[PDB]
């Protein structure tokens, strides 16, 4: 994510604001590093209590793809 | 380009020092072989006209290439062949190694 | 933005403002191309150089401009906070999984380097240390003090486990205070000039 | 407005001694600073056009020295008819002058 | 008013494509400059750019008047209806005049017939630089001219005392250079159309050392310090190590490829390029190193053991040994 932020960041001119296919770029890099915090999460009360972990795993299954949905939808509703 | 051959007549002067200062051409890459120097007519539609030709012979320095792209091709694949010594009930390593040598 | 005259010294030709000093260069409201800078205001003067061949009469006029730092804030420091950030992730997994701490470790060392040199590459081959260079350095100390931090536990891990988890739990909070004070301390002393 | 701080107010000084006036500017003032002598009883008398440089038919013991904002005349032996007041007026923008200051002789 | 008639009376019978005193003697030419800046040196090209205030003077008995007025001083209206030497720069890539808003010239006339005549340059000159001992290199390249078509025999160039002077040498574009002095030079070459009059700047630039110190040096010892961060790591970690190598090695030719892209492609070995291949080697060599710990581990734990306390010490000594050498050798070099 962070490579083609920058790649697709070197085709511009030095634009002091943040246009909005920046504004998609990274709402996508925090929803990756959203994840890996998760799986952080998990991994760090994993041992005191696998229960809460695999509870974690499921609501984190059912409910990244919808508030990711969301963000799309709303980002393509402000834009076009 | 005007005149055509019963006009004007180009030639070398001297036929072999005509052209001087190659030996003293250092290029960074390549390297000046030889030279020679061509006396001839070319036939258009519109005419008959003289032409000289200065054609040089560049060879291709090697050295840059082996120390640039060559070594460290040789290299992945040796770090590549390595895998090889790590037994075979680690395959997190293995495919690690191989993968990473093949997207080098 | 200096222009004078050729072969006429000052005794020949003198120049001067046609209006008020202050109300000659005037610039249009909506004459600015500067997509990085932002203009301040003008400022004339008027002087005289001595030369080999006679004495000529230099008229000035500077400029003021001001960098904006927007693009640079999102294009270097963001991604070196965040990458700091993931190194520090690095403390709150367990001892056990030494492969992931490993890859944290590594990818953020890695990371870093890219981010400086692609730092570097926007500006002239100048030979002195910026302000983001400072930054990029200090981030830089933060994340291989962050491996190192690992590799420490790692080694005393499975002889003094006791010193191990104490050295982990006291830079789970070490690191974070650090470099929150670290970066006030850079925003405060370069943002006030 | 650009509002200049000529000090000192007033100053007295004996016959043949260096004397130093300064003409701190408020905002930017390149090298507009000009220094006017008005004698009592008369219409002032540009002595330094620009920072540094003597008026046609000027004493050379009248000197300017400019910069942004600070400007400072220094007259050097100083004779008995140099005894009244010293305006200092920069012309970058609007002109306007300082307060002056009354030389003089004791 | 009288100007008018001095400036008719001189070209009255006069042919500018006649050198003064064309079948007599060599016309002697007295040269200066006023060196501006001295641009980017830049050594993918072998080039650096130059702005002069270049001024030749000479005599012309034609243009000899007699009057009150001593000095006729003129503007470049009057450039083109005298004879003007064809000063050419033999390395010279590409440079041209000025000619904003009015051609950059200036032209004075004397009363005994002395000429000047100045304009405004700017040169991008060319010098083939020896790249070797980068980035620790000093180079003093020229600025030639001569004469194009006059041989020895009818234009000699000469130098004044005082003729070249530089700037303030502060606002140059000199970035990783740092000028240091210049020196003239004259000399003869053979041409195939005679013998010319050669003239010589030499200005003497030094690199000074900076970005490349915290571009390539840096990082690169930093990797090999990250590389050795694995002579800790416990042995039964194998993926981890084996990452920890993969990662370093990527890394390393990435930056060696980033090096080496800074500067031309040149056939021969450099300091830079040195430097990162001998890290290089020393990342190969601890990822080899744990390749036979790792073998060694399950034929005889001991040397396993030893090996690794061995490499902990045995690698930074023979870091800090290498770089000792390279340093003091090159910087004495
Ligand atoms: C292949 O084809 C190419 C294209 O045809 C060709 O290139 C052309 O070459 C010719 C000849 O070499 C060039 O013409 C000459 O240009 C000289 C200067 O060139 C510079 O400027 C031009 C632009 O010219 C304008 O600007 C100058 C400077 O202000 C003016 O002096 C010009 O008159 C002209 O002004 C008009 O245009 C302006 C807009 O630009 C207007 O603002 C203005 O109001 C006018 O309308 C640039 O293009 C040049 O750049 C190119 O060339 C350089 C060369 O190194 C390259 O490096 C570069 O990369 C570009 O390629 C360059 O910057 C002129 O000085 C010159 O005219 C003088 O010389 C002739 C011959 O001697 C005289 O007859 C003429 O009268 C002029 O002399 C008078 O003026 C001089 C001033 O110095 C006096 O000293 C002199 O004594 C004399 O004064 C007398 O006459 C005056 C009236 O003329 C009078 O007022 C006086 O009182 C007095 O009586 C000539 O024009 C042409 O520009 C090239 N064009 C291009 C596109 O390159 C190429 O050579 C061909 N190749 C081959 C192998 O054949
Ligand atoms: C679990 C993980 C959840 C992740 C959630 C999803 C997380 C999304 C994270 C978005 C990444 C951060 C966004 C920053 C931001 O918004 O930038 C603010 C400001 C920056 O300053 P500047 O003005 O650019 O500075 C120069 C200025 N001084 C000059 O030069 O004039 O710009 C603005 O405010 C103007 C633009 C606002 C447009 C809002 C679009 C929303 C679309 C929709 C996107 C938001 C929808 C959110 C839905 C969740
Ligand atoms: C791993 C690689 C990752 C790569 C990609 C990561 C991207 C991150 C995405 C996540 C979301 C980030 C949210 C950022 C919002 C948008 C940023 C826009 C920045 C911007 O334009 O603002 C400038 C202001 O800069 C300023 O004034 C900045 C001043 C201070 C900068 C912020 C300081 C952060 C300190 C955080 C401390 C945390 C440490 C503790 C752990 C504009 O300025 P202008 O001059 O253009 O015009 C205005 C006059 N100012
Ligand atoms: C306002 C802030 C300004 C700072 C600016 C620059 C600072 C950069 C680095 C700072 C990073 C934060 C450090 C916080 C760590 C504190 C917690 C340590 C826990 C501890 O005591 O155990 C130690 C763990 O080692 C460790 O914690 C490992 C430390 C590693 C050493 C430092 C490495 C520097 C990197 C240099 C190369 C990169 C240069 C970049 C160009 C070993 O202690 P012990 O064995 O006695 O355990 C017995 C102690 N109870
Ligand atoms: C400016 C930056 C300011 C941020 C300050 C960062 C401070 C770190 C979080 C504070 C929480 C204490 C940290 C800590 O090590 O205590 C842990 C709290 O546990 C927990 O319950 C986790 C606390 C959640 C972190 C709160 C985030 C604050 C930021 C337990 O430590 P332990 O070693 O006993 O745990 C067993 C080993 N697995
Ligand atoms: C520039 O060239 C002139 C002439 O060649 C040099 O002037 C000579 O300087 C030496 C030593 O300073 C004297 O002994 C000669 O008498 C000088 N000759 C003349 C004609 O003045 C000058 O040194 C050169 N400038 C350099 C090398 O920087
Ligand atoms: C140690 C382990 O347990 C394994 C498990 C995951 C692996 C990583 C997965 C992907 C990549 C990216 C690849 O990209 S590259 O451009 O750097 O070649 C380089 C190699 C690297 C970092 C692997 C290294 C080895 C691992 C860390």
């Known amino acids: 994510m962070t490579t083609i932020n920058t790649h697709l960041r070197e085709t511009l001119p030095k634009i002091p604001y943040v246009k909005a296919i920046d504004m998609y770029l990274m709402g996508c890099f925090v ?8 799986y952080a999460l998990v991994n760090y009360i994993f041992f005191s209590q696998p229960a809460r972990a695999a509870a974690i795993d499921r609501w984190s299954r059912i409910f990244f793809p919808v508030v990711f949905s969301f963000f799309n939808i709303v980002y393509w509703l402000y834009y076009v | 380009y005007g005149y055509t051959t019963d006009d004007i007549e180009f030639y070398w002067r001297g036929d072999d020092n005509a052209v001087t200062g190659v030996t003293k051409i250092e290029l960074p890459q390549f390297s000046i072989v030889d030279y020679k120097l061509i006396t001839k007519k070319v036939v258009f539609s519109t005419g008959s006209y003289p032409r000289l030709s200065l054609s040089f012979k560049l060879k291709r320095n090697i050295g840059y290439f082996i120390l640039q792209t060559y070594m460290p091709s040789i290299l992945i694949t040796i770090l590549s062949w390595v895998s090889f010594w790590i037994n075979y009930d680690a395959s997190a390593a293995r495919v690690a190694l191989g993968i990473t040598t093949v997207l080098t | 933005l200096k222009f004078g005259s050729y072969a006429y010294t000052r005794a020949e030709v003198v120049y001067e403002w046609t209006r008020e000093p202050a109300r000659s260069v005037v610039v249009a409201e909506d004459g600015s191309r500067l997509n990085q800078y932002d203009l301040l205001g003008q400022t004339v003067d008027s002087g005289i150089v001595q030369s080999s061949t006679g004495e000529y009469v230099v008229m000035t006029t500077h400029f003021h401009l001001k960098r904006k ?35 944290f470790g590594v990818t953020t060392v890695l990371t870093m380097t890219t981010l400086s040199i692609s730092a570097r590459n926007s500006l002239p081959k100048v030979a002195y240390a910026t302000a983001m260079d400072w930054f990029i350095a200090v981030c830089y100390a933060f994340v291989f003090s962050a491996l190192i931090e690992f590799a420490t536990v790692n080694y005393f891990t499975k002889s003094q486990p006791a010193r191990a988890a104490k050295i982990d739990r006291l830079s789970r909070i070490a690191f974070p205070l650090l470099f929150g004070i670290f970066n006030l301390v850079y925003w405060a002393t370069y943002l006030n000039r | 407005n650009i509002v200049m701080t000529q000090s000192p107010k007033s100053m007295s000084m004996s016959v043949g001694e260096r004397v130093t006036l300064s003409c701190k500017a408020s905002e930017y003032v390149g090298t507009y600073v000009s220094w006017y002598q008005q004698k009592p009883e008369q219409s002032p008398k540009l002595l330094i056009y620009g920072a540094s440089n003597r008026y046609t038919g000027v004493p ?7 910069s942004a904002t600070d400007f400072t005349l220094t007259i050097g032996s100083v004779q008995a008819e140099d005894l009244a007041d010293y305006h200092c007026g920069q012309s970058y923008s609007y002109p306007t002058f300082g307060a002056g200051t009354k030389l003089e002789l004791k | 008013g009288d100007v008018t008639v001095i400036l008719n009376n001189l070209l009255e019978g006069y042919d500018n494509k006649l050198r003064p005193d064309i079948g007599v003697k060599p016309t002697l030419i007295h040269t200066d400059m006023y060196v501006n800046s001295i641009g980017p040196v830049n050594a993918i090209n072998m080039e650096y750019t130059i702005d002069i205030f270049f001024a030749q003077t000479w005599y012309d008995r034609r243009l000899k008047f007699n009057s009150t007025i ?36 200036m032209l004075r006339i004397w009363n005994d017939g002395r000429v000047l005549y100045t304009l405004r340059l700017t040169i991008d000159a060319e010098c083939q630089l020896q790249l070797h001992n980068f980035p620790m290199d000093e180079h003093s390249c020229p600025l030639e001219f001569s004469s194009y078509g006059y041989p020895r025999e009818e234009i000699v160039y000469q130098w004044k005392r005082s003729s070249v002077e530089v700037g303030d040498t502060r606002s140059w574009r000199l970035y990783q250079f740092s000028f240091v002095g210049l020196r003239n030079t004259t000399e003869v070459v053979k041409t195939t159309s005679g013998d010319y009059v050669v003239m010589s700047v030499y200005f003497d630039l030094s690199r000074r050392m900076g970005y490349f110190t915290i571009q390539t040096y840096i990082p690169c010892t930093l990797i090999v310090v990250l590389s050795w961060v694995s002579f800790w790591i416990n042995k039964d970690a194998v993926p981890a190590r084996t990452s920890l190598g993969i990662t370093t090695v990527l890394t390393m030719t990435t930056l060696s490829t980033i090096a080496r892209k800074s500067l031309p492609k040149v056939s021969y070995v450099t300091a830079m390029d040195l430097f990162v291949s001998v890290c290089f080697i020393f990342v190969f060599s601890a990822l080899v190193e744990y390749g036979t710990l790792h073998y060694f581990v399950s034929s005889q734990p001991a040397r396993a053991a030893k090996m690794d306390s061995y490499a902990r010490i045995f690698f930074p000594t023979a870091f800090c040994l290498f770089n000792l050498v390279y340093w003091v050798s090159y910087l004495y070099l």
């Not at chain 3, 963001?78 to 190194?87: D, G, K, Q, R, W």
């Not at chain 5, 209206?77 to 000063?87: L, S």
């Open chain 4, 60 to 66: 050379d013991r009248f000197t300017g020295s400019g």
């Open chain 3, 69 to 103: 730092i927007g693009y640079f804030v999102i294009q270097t420091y963001l991604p070196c906070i965040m990458t700091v950030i993931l190194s520090q992730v690095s403390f709150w997994l367990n001892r056990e999984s030494v492969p992931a701490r490993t890859v």
């Open chain 5, 70 to 105: 001593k000095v006729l001083r003129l503007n470049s209206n009057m450039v083109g209806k005298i004879w003007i030497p064809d000063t050419f720069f033999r390395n010279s890539k590409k440079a041209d005049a000025h000619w904003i808003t009015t051609p950059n010239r």
């Open chain 1, 31 to 38: 929803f990756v590093f959203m994840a890996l915090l998760e």
